[PDB]
Design a protein around this nucleic acid. Structure first.
Length: 207
RNA sequence: GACCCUGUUGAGCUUGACUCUAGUUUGACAUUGUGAAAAGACAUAGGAGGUGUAGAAUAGGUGGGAGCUUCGGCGCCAGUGAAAUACCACUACUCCUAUUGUUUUUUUACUUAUUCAAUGUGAAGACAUUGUCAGGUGGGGAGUUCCUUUAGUCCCUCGAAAUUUGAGGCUAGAGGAGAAAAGUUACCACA
């Protein structure tokens, strides 16, 4: 891809689309990738994540699976703390867990609870795309969720097209372009061969 | 009456080497041309589409998305569902049309491929016949003396489904002089 080209593309909307619509949103821009002739029914399916230290996400909805030494820090940070009793009542009710997954699409988990969940309620709802990344031994949750989030999973499905929504109008062109370029470079690296495999890529905004 | 054994017979079970090959057989390709008429798949540019169950309802699929404005109807939230509908972005198949093009197959037509007859030219026909590779079987001919199970590292390949499997691969135990016949049975018949 060409830097000057993505420059007028971000210009085609960050200095035009918003003038055309002028609509009240927490505006986010998405770029979508479709590939020409690599059937997903075959082998070597790709699945990776991006380290994004910008997080144009910040309309956030996060859930935690924390053990002791986390209730107080979660309360101070304004995140609901979930423990063994709360988890066993989620174990009793099997639809409210899906409703709360909808409420908190994003999950984070600790070692003991990620080891304890696969008894019966793990695989039951595992068909939702909630893969919880285990926390490290640093146990310093300050901003660790910030790096854990905004990690887009380039997961290949039975449909041969996908999209990644990164970039808002609150932050500016240099870092939004840096984020999208690094996401594209990671996608090319994860793909089986050269960037020429990509047929068409759209950088147009939400409206 | 009944029990044991022997011989012949019947019924049943097992064994009867390996390597090439005759024969037989499957598939692909080649001689080998000219046309015409249809069919399939490739090339675009378009058009139309998605009804298992439950769901108000005909839910291609994926993505963001809490609020969308022809400014009144919608969302969201509730349901119901693997999947939820407002907003707007992408490619994925199915069914049709057109020309600014490629191939492959079927039928038909004609001889130049090819086949048959003769000597000091005629008939059939792109089918036969023939040839090259990949293989299957090989109780026949010639020569010489592969699969299955077990336990293991979770070490490698192929196939499948996505959040796991099947088949092979490795280590070393166990099964399978040779087309003349051989072994065997609390069985049958005769003696």
């Amino acid at each position: 891809i060409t830097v000057a080209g993505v420059r007028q593309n971000v210009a085609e909307l960050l200095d035009y689309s918003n003038n055309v619509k002028k609509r009240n949103f927490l505006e986010t821009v998405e770029l979508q990738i479709g590939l020409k002739n690599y059937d997903p029914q075959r082998d070597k399916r790709f699945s990776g994540t991006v380290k994004l230290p910008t997080v144009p996400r910040p309309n956030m909805s996060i859930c935690i699976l924390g053990d002791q030494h986390d209730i107080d820090r979660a309360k101070h940070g304004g995140i609901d703390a979930m423990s063994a009793d709360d988890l066993k009542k989620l174990n009793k009710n099997k639809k409210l867990i899906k409703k709360l997954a909808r409420k908190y699409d994003a999950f984070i988990a600790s070692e003991s609870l990620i080891k304890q969940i696969p008894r019966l309620l793990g695989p039951g709802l595992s068909k939702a795309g909630k893969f919880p990344t285990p926390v490290s031994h640093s146990d310093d949750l300050s901003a660790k969720v910030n790096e854990v989030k905004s990690t887009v999973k380039f997961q290949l499905k039975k449909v041969l097209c996908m999209g990644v929504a990164v970039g808002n109008v609150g932050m500016t062109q240099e870092q939004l372009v840096a984020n999208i370029m690094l996401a594209i470079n990671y996608l090319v690296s994860l793909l089986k061969k050269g960037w020429q495999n990509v047929g068409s890529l759209t950088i147009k905004a939400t409206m």
